[PDB]
Design a protein around this ligand. Structure first.
Ligand SMILES: CCC1=C(C)/C(=C/C2=NC(=C\c3[nH]c(/C=C4\NC(=O)[C@H](C)[C@H]4CC)c(C)c3CCC(=O)O)/C(CCC(=O)O)=C2C)NC1=O
Ligand SMILES: CCC1=C(C)/C(=C/C2=NC(=C\c3[nH]c(/C=C4\NC(=O)[C@H](C)[C@H]4CC)c(C)c3CCC(=O)O)/C(CCC(=O)O)=C2C)NC1=O
Ligand SMILES: CCC1=C(C)/C(=C/C2=NC(=C\c3[nH]c(/C=C4\NC(=O)[C@H](C)[C@H]4CC)c(C)c3CCC(=O)O)/C(CCC(=O)O)=C2C)NC1=O
Ligand SMILES: CCC1=C(C)/C(=C/C2=NC(=C\c3[nH]c(/C=C4\NC(=O)[C@H](C)[C@H]4CC)c(C)c3CCC(=O)O)/C(CCC(=O)O)=C2C)NC1=O
Ligand SMILES: CCC1=C(C)/C(=C/C2=NC(=C\c3[nH]c(/C=C4\NC(=O)[C@H](C)[C@H]4CC)c(C)c3CCC(=O)O)/C(CCC(=O)O)=C2C)NC1=O
Ligand SMILES: CCC1=C(C)/C(=C/C2=NC(=C\c3[nH]c(/C=C4\NC(=O)[C@H](C)[C@H]4CC)c(C)c3CCC(=O)O)/C(CCC(=O)O)=C2C)NC1=O
Ligand SMILES: CCC1=C(C)/C(=C/C2=NC(=C\c3[nH]c(/C=C4\NC(=O)[C@H](C)[C@H]4CC)c(C)c3CCC(=O)O)/C(CCC(=O)O)=C2C)NC1=O
Ligand SMILES: CCC1=C(C)/C(=C/C2=NC(=C\c3[nH]c(/C=C4\NC(=O)[C@H](C)[C@H]4CC)c(C)c3CCC(=O)O)/C(CCC(=O)O)=C2C)NC1=O
Ligand SMILES: CCC1=C(C)/C(=C/C2=NC(=C\c3[nH]c(/C=C4\NC(=O)[C@H](C)[C@H]4CC)c(C)c3CCC(=O)O)/C(CCC(=O)O)=C2C)NC1=O
Ligand SMILES: CCC1=C(C)/C(=C/C2=NC(=C\c3[nH]c(/C=C4\NC(=O)[C@H](C)[C@H]4CC)c(C)c3CCC(=O)O)/C(CCC(=O)O)=C2C)NC1=O
Ligand SMILES: CCC1=C(C)/C(=C/C2=NC(=C\c3[nH]c(/C=C4\NC(=O)[C@H](C)[C@H]4CC)c(C)c3CCC(=O)O)/C(CCC(=O)O)=C2C)NC1=O
Lengths: 48, 96, 161, 96, 160, 48, 161, 161, 161, 161, 161, 160
């Protein structure tokens, strides 16, 4: 399922990684927080 | 920038104060520097009596250069310029 | 990066010289080979995948390299290796179009020797992978372009060794 | 080794060939072995004879520029052929 | 060049040169022989272009060669024409490459800061360049004069 | 060719995921010590 | 990082060996101690703060270290020191769960000796802070787990000296 | 960074000493020169651009430095050089206000010698650019402040050589 | 350099303390392991050459490292590499006798990482050469001494990575 | 150092390749120009002093450089400068005989840019001294050798700028 | 190095000027103070040891500096410190005879600040050791010479800070 | 080469090449095609030379392929002939270079230390190297066989 390609700029090269190559490594913890909605005011956050 | 980037990612990255990317990118495009055949940390400070030498662990600023084996270093003569010996082979017998 | 033409412009700019006869002769020597460079790039690009497959077949696989203990063992590493091969082919095609190897230094060779030492990637085996792709390329592009394509593969391979 | 060389033969090493000669003599013979090459070289004898005491012969550019160089360089880098106005106001004043 | 503005662009997406992208890499090649010729022609008459540019400039702006003017005096005027010689040179470079590229790095990026320090009136440098366009353009065929003229108007544009 | 270097390191890249590592790598990204629930999972895996 | 289950796999993979009897025996030797490792981690985690407090009290504070001129003088540095202590405790708990010290090298010891030399951080005093936390830990976790927890504290402390 | 006053506070803090007579005398020696430092900074700031222009005119331009082959050739590099000059002037003004050179080490000198060696930037020529700005500054600020401004320009210039 | 005993003496000297109970306990912990350290050194010294040979055979040769393009290609470089190996073995034997790693920092590790980066010497491959000599050493010296010899090989190898 | 014959061997040795057709073609391209290189060296050597004299006359003396305040003021420095000139001429003659610029890097350019920055030696003025000697050389050696001599003077001069 | 007289000669030599009235006035201003410089040097030289002892007694010893943890603790370091003191005294005596501080830069200050940072040598404490020797010197040499000796001690001390 | 050895003398005395130095480069290069032919013939028969060298060696000293011998076994033997293949290669390099610079850096400096470590018996190795001379020399004309023979005897010399 494709190679993840990481896009550059006029100064540095575009590179790609084989997809299965990142799938055999530790899988990335990430932290995200909401998008805030629209019912009344601000997010809520609607998180725990 | 593999090697340098790996250092930047360490948690000891802020213990180094000399810049490393601007200095690395500039080196790539210039001729070899004059430093010792091994590191930049390998030649001592030139004062009267010490044996001074920078540390590595102490406030790290490593700098290496791919240096050949046939590279011969340019050294200034503590004396008159034309007795340099690289251009005048018996310049150590002339005068003082 | 620089190509044939900007190599000359920057060499004169640092002297603040208008282009003179010697400069103009160099640029002609580039322009006069230009159409042939383009045709050669279109052959390489459109045969990219076949060149890698024939180069790997002659110089990498059916070997200890692809067996357990070998650096191109595992689908992960086999993929990384032929990924690399595609870089080399693609950039050599850039260098040959530009008529200047400077891009091979700036975007490919810089730090690569030590990167390979650090991962354990076998250098000599990678050079053979480069010189096998050259062999295939030189057949496909023909008399017109063979020598000109070849040199940037040779630039790549003496850059690692 | 690099520091010891400056003291016994007045200059820094020029090369890796030279540096390595001693590095691989020190691993078989020690401190004593290394000392005895700087002392027994052909170069020691041509330069220092047998009555002269060794002296400092060469310096590196970094080392030279710490002796001097504080206060920069006083000079102005001149050029052959430049169009410059330096000193014309002063000449004009003397004429007046 | 046209090339630089181009092989580097089809490398920010990791691919080979597009079949349409090797066509801009075709017009320029044909153009380059003509482009090289125009630069050579400009180079031949450089001393005349600069000098006549310098007269055209000082009529149109006599204030720069006056008591409180940046170019007042014989050697403040000598350096001024030398700067006009610099820019004509860069214009020949720009024409030949087919892309302005190197001229920018050599003589417009930083030019505001340089001349502000020296206190040189920038817009009268732009006039000196228009003056060179007028002279240079009178030594070239209609078609070549236009092709040259774009690069003169660029420099005039960048000092702005 | 090759005018400068930044050196080399001792990279250790991951061949495969293996559960002990996924759990442990996971805890680090949050910098915490095993959850009260999380401890149980090691026992089943140790348990089998 | 690697753990006992993972190490057995990578140690055999580089030889391209199926897991054989010797391998299977090693893995059993880990699994058979596994439940005890978990219980020990839950004691350490839930007594974390008290272990640091008792370890500092026996081996760091009431001393020249906490007085003007001492490295753990100032609330800033006292905080940094017991922050460090928490790292050690926490990672040793990881190493002991994994049954492998490799994480203590990768994420704790690498460069730390020189980092401490560069800041002036007293190494010998830090080792005593490690061996005092071990002493407390060995009481809290009991016969079952005492020896196994202890070794990764000893790994940490001979890693600095 | 530190100034006169925090230099003293930190020197006593590491000994855990309340400020004594010797300390109090030092701080007075700073406060008593304070109003003059402020006036001098307002002259430098408001003449910043003229100081750079007169310093460049006496020590940099009309030379091989600004000609092809020279390091301040190209509008790019000429701009970078007088940009640098502004840093020096501005930071020296900070050092002189603070009555302490520590900021010149932390934010200006650290690594700068080698940065200039790596780019090819001429050190001796840069020192003359510093000592020319000092010359101009010492005229503009007057008897009151001349010696005090001057020292931090001299600090800068022996920091490079 | 320092050993176990002088490590303690200098730690107390800076406090101007006569040796107390805690100090005396540390020194005992060294003396009580001393005879075993000596026996272990005599085994290593007298098997020096065989340890290098078996360590190279398991971790260096029969590989791309010894082939053209490899860093231990040429009799010159092969000789330099096993020369290095002898240093490591010999100094680790000193560290283990002294019961202190300080000599490994002062006379072996300082600047070595960058020296190897500058020559192109493969770091990861050198570590394997260290950890293979440890493996051999631990067999030859026996239960008594295995753990104690091992740590200074591990000190060496995390000093490079 | 390396020369065209030697470079072909070391470039192939690192790949462990026999010399093949591409290699053999390169070496021929050197041998076939060899007699002309020799004749050119004999002209340069025997006109050495006149080339320096005419190059200095067109590009250095009769100027501010030779006047008080100039870097080639004093018989000492004038002597050092034309001494340098002789180095350049002599080494360029070596590079051109070898058909390889590697000697110009190893024994002339390495550190020279910074050496000149440290002494104050004007770089741009030195380049003109190089490109004036090239001009003279190209007249004396004739059609046969002009382009080949010229390139190593151009190598020298872009090595400083 | 340079003295009063050679300072003037070299300042005129770079302009190629014969000595004029302004120059001749400067040299007179030196010669006219010369006999007094000599007498002052004979007092300093012959009281050298007593000046160091009284300067150390007022500004260094009876303190934490000489106690465990202090930089002049150990007979080794106490000896190194008063050795240094003798250098300062001796060179300041040279500077004052020469009527020029250039020797204090060339042979004493260059690199010394960083040398002291690298060893841990306390800078502020060393300055007090310099300004205490000045105090003693100014008593011993009398009205004639007090101001002239004093300045080169002040040169030394603002060279470190 | 002759060039590398000689130019080095030029640069070290800060001078252009001598008439003598120029003459030897000329005489040397004239002897090029012949040297290339000598290398080709030997490259073309490498497998035969090695194998027949290996038989000649083990008769003159077999013990190495016996229970307590360094080369005892199929893969301990696969390495001894491989080393003989290495040295024949270096001999072809030396012949085309006209001196030993390359032969020396690649395979004699450090060779004592390498083989002492491996406890390969070095002096047996010299005899093995000598055998290759005998085979190679039988595939070359008298004149070319002598020219080749100098380089074989050098390696034999360096070993010991
Ligand atoms: C000719 C000009 C010249 C000078 C001035 C000079 C200074 C100098 N002082 C040094 C060390 C030192 N300098 C001191 C000085 C002091 N300790 C204190 O606590 C006081 C604040 C201060 C005395 C007032 C000490 C204690 C050391 C030893 C540091 C060590 O143990 O390594 C060293 C290191 C080498 C050595 O130990 O001898 C040098 C080179 N070297 C020179 O060539
Ligand atoms: C073998 C390769 C090699 C080279 C090329 C070399 C160059 C070199 N030039 C030097 C100095 C110098 N070089 C020059 C050169 C010039 N002055 C000018 O104004 C001109 C622009 C230029 C001549 C065209 C001058 C004037 C000095 C003396 C600087 C001083 O007074 O210290 C020095 C300092 C030591 C000495 O004075 O001899 C070296 C090492 N050294 C080497 O080993
Ligand atoms: C453990 C996960 C894993 C697998 C399985 C793997 C396989 C793998 N199979 C390969 C080739 C090959 N594999 C096969 C055949 C087959 N393969 C099959 O799984 C079938 C049983 C059979 C077809 C019926 C053939 C014929 C080739 C030669 C490649 C070619 O077509 O030229 C190659 C290229 C190198 C080589 O020749 O060995 C790899 C890397 N790599 C991995 O990391
Ligand atoms: C744009 C220019 C560019 C290049 C050329 C490049 C090379 C490159 N090759 C890599 C790894 C690698 N390279 C190879 C290559 C090979 N394996 C073999 O056995 C063969 C000898 C050879 C193929 C012919 C392998 C197997 C790895 C994976 C190493 C690992 O497992 O970590 C990596 C590490 C990151 C990654 O795994 O992707 C880089 C950056 N990166 C770049 O940005
Ligand atoms: C200058 C910055 C700074 C501060 C403030 C500081 C405080 C400090 N207070 C301490 C203990 C202590 N501090 C207190 C203080 C109190 N007990 C109470 O109930 C009251 C609320 C409070 C008095 C107002 C007590 C009782 C201890 C002893 C606690 C123990 O030993 O467990 C200790 C540990 C003993 C030692 O080694 O010195 C430190 C380091 N350290 C610092 O570096
Ligand atoms: C995740 C693994 C990891 C570790 C272990 C780690 C240690 C570490 N300890 C540090 C400082 C420090 N460490 C200490 C430790 C102590 N002071 C003492 O006197 C005692 C002997 C000792 C506590 C027992 C102190 C006081 C500092 C502050 C030094 C300073 O003021 O700059 C720093 C410098 C950055 C900072 O201040 O936070 C690091 C990175 N960093 C890491 O990323
Ligand atoms: C190739 C890129 C490039 C350019 C263009 C450049 C220009 C440049 N123009 C300068 C001066 C000057 N330039 C001028 C120019 C003018 N006076 C006027 O009033 C007119 C508007 C204008 C003429 C059209 C004058 C009068 C000076 C002298 C200013 C002074 O000395 O203060 C100087 C300082 C003198 C020197 O050291 O050379 C530089 C560097 N340098 C470069 O590297
Ligand atoms: C007393 C403490 C001490 C140590 C440890 C030391 C190491 C050291 N190793 C060196 C080179 C080297 N080191 C190696 C090592 C290796 N090659 C490989 O491929 C392997 C990964 C590895 C062996 C396991 C090699 C091949 C060189 C030669 C690099 C060159 O050709 O310049 C050099 C450069 C000088 C020389 O060549 O002798 C030093 C100083 N020097 C010292 O003074
Ligand atoms: C202060 C140290 C110093 C000295 C002495 C010096 C001398 C010097 N004499 C020169 C020329 C000259 N010098 C002379 C001198 C003489 N002709 C004769 O036959 C007589 C023997 C002699 C007069 C007594 C002549 C004729 C020239 C012109 C030579 C030429 O142009 O080829 C030149 C080149 C012209 C120039 O650029 O100035 C210099 C630099 N330069 C210095 O920096
Ligand atoms: C551990 C190594 C070490 C030693 C030994 C040492 C001795 C030492 N003895 C001192 C003074 C002294 N020491 C003595 C000792 C004596 N008076 C006599 O007549 C007797 C012969 C002798 C007693 C047996 C005296 C009287 C003074 C005071 C001298 C003065 O103040 O002028 C001082 C200066 C005072 C101070 O700041 O502490 C030091 C540093 N320092 C060290 O770092
Ligand atoms: C091109 C320069 C060069 C040479 C020559 C070289 C030789 C070399 N010979 C080796 C082994 C060997 N070489 C031999 C050779 C012999 N046994 C005998 O008794 C005979 C005297 C002799 C055959 C004539 C043997 C038997 C081994 C195996 C020794 C062992 O494995 O312990 C090895 C270790 C195996 C390997 O990793 O390749 C090297 C590196 N390496 C180099 O880089």
């Amino acid at each position: 399922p494709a190679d993840i390609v990481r896009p550059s700029s006029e100064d540095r090269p575009g590179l790609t990684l084989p997809y299965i190559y990142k799938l055999s490594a530790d899988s990335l913890t990430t932290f995200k927080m909401t998008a805030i909605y629209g019912a009344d005011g601000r997010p809520k956050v609607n998180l725990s | 920038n593999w090697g340098a980037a790996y250092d930047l990612y360490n948690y000891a990255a802020p213990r180094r104060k000399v810049p490393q990317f601007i200095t690395l990118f500039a080196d790539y495009t210039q001729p070899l520097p004059n430093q010792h055949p091994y590191g930049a940390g390998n030649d001592p400070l030139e004062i009267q009596f010490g044996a001074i030498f920078k540390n590595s662990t102490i406030n790290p600023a490593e700098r290496a250069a791919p240096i050949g084996k046939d590279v011969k270093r340019i050294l200034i003569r503590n004396g008159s310029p034309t007795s340099n010996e690289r251009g005048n082979p018996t310049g150590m017998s002339e005068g003082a | 990066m620089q190509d044939a033409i900007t190599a000359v412009i920057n060499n004169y700019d640092v002297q603040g010289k208008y282009l003179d006869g010697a400069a103009l002769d160099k640029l002609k020597a580039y322009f006069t080979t230009g159409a042939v460079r383009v045709r050669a790039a279109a052959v390489i690009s459109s045969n990219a995948t076949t060149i890698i497959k024939e180069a790997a077949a002659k110089a990498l696989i059916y070997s200890d390299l692809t067996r357990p203990g070998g650096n191109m063992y595992t689908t992960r590493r086999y993929a990384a290796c032929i990924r690399d091969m595609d870089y080399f082919l693609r950039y050599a095609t850039y260098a040959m179009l530009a008529g200047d190897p400077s891009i091979l230094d700036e975007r490919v060779l810089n730090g690569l020797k030590e990167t390979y030492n650090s991962l354990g990637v076998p250098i000599a085996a990678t050079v053979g992978g480069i010189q096998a792709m050259k062999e295939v390329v030189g057949g496909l592009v023909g008399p017109d372009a063979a020598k000109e394509a070849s040199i940037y593969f040779d630039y790549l391979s003496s850059g690692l060794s | 080794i690099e520091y010891i060389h400056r003291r016994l033969l007045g200059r820094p090493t020029y090369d890796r060939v030279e540096n390595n000669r001693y590095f691989d003599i020190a691993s078989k013979k020690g401190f004593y072995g290394v000392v005895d090459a700087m002392l027994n070289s052909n170069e020691y004898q041509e330069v220092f004879g047998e009555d002269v005491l060794p002296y400092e012969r060469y310096l590196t550019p970094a080392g030279l520029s710490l002796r001097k160089g504080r206060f920069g360089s006083s000079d102005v880098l001149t050029t052959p052929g430049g169009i410059t106005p330096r000193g014309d106001a002063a000449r004009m004043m003397d004429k007046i | 060049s046209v090339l630089t503005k181009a092989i580097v662009n089809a490398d920010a997406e990791a691919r080979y040169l597009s079949p349409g992208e090797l066509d801009r890499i075709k017009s320029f090649v044909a153009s380059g022989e003509r482009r090289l010729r125009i630069a050579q022609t400009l180079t031949e008459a450089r001393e005349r272009i600069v000098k006549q540019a310098g007269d055209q400039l000082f009529q149109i702006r006599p204030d720069v060669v006056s008591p409180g003017g940046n170019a007042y005096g014989e050697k403040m005027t000598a350096l001024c024409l030398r700067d006009l010689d610099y820019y004509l040179r860069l214009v020949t470079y720009g024409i030949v490459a087919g892309d302005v590229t190197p001229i920018e790095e050599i003589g417009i990026i930083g030019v505001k800061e340089m001349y502000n320090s020296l206190q040189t009136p920038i817009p009268a440098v732009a006039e000196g360049v228009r003056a060179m366009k007028n002279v240079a353009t009178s030594l070239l065929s209609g078609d070549d004069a236009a092709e040259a003229g774009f690069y003169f108007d660029y420099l005039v544009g960048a000092m702005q | 060719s090759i005018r400068g270097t930044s050196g080399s390191t001792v990279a250790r890249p991951r061949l495969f995921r293996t559960v002990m590592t996924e759990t442990i790598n996971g805890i680090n990204a949050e910098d915490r010590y095993p959850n009260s629930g999380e401890v149980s999972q090691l026992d089943q895996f140790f348990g089998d």
